[PDB]
């Protein structure tokens, strides 16, 4: 019951899913052949959340994979746990977008999306009670940031009451791999605010910083960043698949973390994270988890959370632990940092406990906090956008496929209005 379907688009989203599904399968004891080989009874009670049942007793994820080029899905199939995905759900084009948002949203993405919407509708109509959808995509690419966001609007138009999740990677100015990143980032943020019920920003720069400083491993690769993102993704829905002292589905988090409908851009972090050589030194206790949870360097975004004030915060503890300690520590982390918490909403931290810890760990915490410090990312994105747009650089590529500069002006104005009205509440006082 109350299950969700997985939809991913683009190369970055496909690579994120290729590790997210591996993590989920390892958590539930599903072999790469789809056969259950788990140890505990609880591993099968709520498997309908992510997995479907077919004849022969094997399980198949309800994931939908879409891209405008076939290479990435032809590569993910040969990887481990690549056989679980149903071949029918693979939809792809023969041309690609070339990191051009217009091509992936107006000319090419519009004709292809009917086929993927057909299978999306097939998956949603069938399921017992829908909880919602979760979306993984990147804002630094053309086909992803175009087709995914248009699909968001199409899904929202047909299921207005369901919940919608988006895990979005925004292009940081530090590690830049594409010159046309500001254009399709700014165009995508315009559409994303209007339809997504929840959005979670993730930055490659913050992932590299975490890998270099906390884990202290010499050579980070995309596999480590994907693993961290996958652990963070799994931590959110853990209590929906396992029993606990205070169950809290996604809708309950939506109620408690979004004060106003347009303020739904969160930054997350996962604890504990320790190096291989120091994993024996540390002792896992609730104070040790909560001190690392609120650490500024532990956030999955380069945004500095002590440059603003938290509107609200959430924590999803895992493992068996006493609730009194959790509540007193949450109170203590809020009394010692009163300057960084907005004062006109008292008791702005939500907590939840799940009795099933991750495989290999005795305690774990997932942190989701809505803070005013996120304005800095939109500020720098808009700064680069307005630095590049004033000369109409690279504009002809977009304008040759039916798009105009008016949609750029409206997007810039709406993004600046969002930036302004997000900080409006930072200076608000009672």
């Amino acid at each position: 019951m109350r299950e969700i379907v997985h939809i991913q688009g683009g190369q970055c989203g496909n690579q994120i899913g290729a590790k997210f599904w591996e993590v989920i399968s390892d958590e539930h004891g599903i072999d790469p052949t789809g056969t259950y080989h788990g140890d505990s009874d609880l591993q099968l009670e709520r498997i309908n959340v992510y997995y479907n049942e077919a004849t022969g007793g094997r399980y198949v994820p309800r994931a939908i994979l879409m891209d405008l080029e076939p290479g990435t899905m032809d590569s993910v199939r040969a990887g481990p746990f690549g056989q679980l995905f149903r071949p029918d759900n693979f939809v792809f084009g023969q041309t690609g977008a070339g990191n051009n948002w217009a091509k992936g949203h107006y000319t090419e993405g519009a004709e292809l999306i009917d086929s993927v919407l057909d299978v999306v509708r097939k998956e949603a109509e069938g399921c017992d009670c829908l909880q919602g959808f979760q979306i993984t995509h990147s804002l630094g690419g053309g086909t992803g940031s175009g087709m995914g966001t248009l699909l968001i609007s199409k899904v929202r138009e047909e299921y207005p009451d369901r919940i919608m999740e988006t895990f979005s990677v925004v292009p940081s100015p530090k590690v830049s791999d594409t010159v046309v990143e500001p254009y399709n980032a700014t165009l995508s943020v315009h559409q994303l605010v209007e339809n997504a019920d929840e959005c979670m920003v993730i930055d490659n720069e913050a992932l590299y910083d975490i890998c270099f400083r906390t884990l202290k491993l010499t050579t980070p690769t995309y596999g480590d960043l994907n693993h961290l993102v996958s652990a963070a993704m799994s931590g959110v829905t853990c209590c929906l698949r396992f029993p606990g002292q205070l169950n809290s589905d996604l809708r309950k988090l939506a109620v408690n973390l979004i004060p106003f409908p347009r303020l739904h851009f969160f930054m997350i972090g996962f604890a504990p994270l320790t190096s291989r050589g120091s994993q024996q030194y540390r002792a896992l206790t609730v104070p040790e988890l909560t001190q690392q949870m609120f650490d500024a360097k532990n956030m999955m975004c380069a945004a500095d959370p002590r440059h603003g004030r938290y509107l609200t915060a959430s924590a999803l503890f895992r493992g068996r632990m006493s609730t009194k300690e959790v509540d007193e520590q949450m109170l203590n982390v809020q009394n010692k940092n009163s300057s960084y918490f907005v004062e006109w909403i008292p008791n702005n931290i939500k907590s939840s406990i799940c009795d099933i810890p991750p495989k290999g760990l005795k305690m774990a915490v997932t942190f989701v906090g809505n803070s005013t410090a996120i304005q800095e990312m939109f500020k720098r994105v808009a700064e680069q956008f307005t630095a590049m747009f004033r000369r109409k650089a690279f504009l002809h590529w977009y304008t040759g496929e039916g798009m105009d500069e008016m949609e750029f002006t409206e997007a810039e104005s709406n993004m600046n209005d969002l930036v302004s009205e997000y900080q409006q509440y930072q200076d608000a006082t009672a």
Binding site: D39, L42, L215, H227, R276, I356, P357, K359
Partner: protein, 103 residues
């Protein structure tokens, strides 16, 4: 109780320079899911599913109390041992005085 043996046992000291001699003689990371067996963090996969802080805490609490109880009996016994020696020594002193007088 500071203590030394007889003169013969030390046998190093009659104008020793051995001590001087000794100085001359010297001239996609996967560590999250794979914490070390030694570490506190590692909970066995088989035991991953006991879900009750209640029962577990009660057994743990009982054990934490018991160590303190044995420790208390032992430290008190040490206290008793210094005092016993002093009581014995005073009694011994009287016996000894008595012994020399009889000699």
């Amino acid at each position: 109780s500071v203590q030394p043996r007889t003169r013969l046992e030390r046998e190093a000291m009659k104008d020793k320079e051995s001590i001087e001699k000794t100085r001359i003689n010297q001239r996609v990371k996967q560590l999250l899911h794979n914490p070390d067996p030694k570490s506190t963090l590692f909970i066995p996969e088989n035991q991953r599913f006991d879900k009750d802080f209640s029962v577990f805490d009660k057994q743990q609490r009982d054990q934490r109390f018991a160590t303190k109880e044995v420790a208390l009996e032992k430290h008190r016994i040490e206290a008793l041992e210094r005092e016993s020696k002093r009581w014995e020594q005073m009694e011994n002193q009287v016996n000894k005085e008595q012994v020399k007088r009889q000699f």
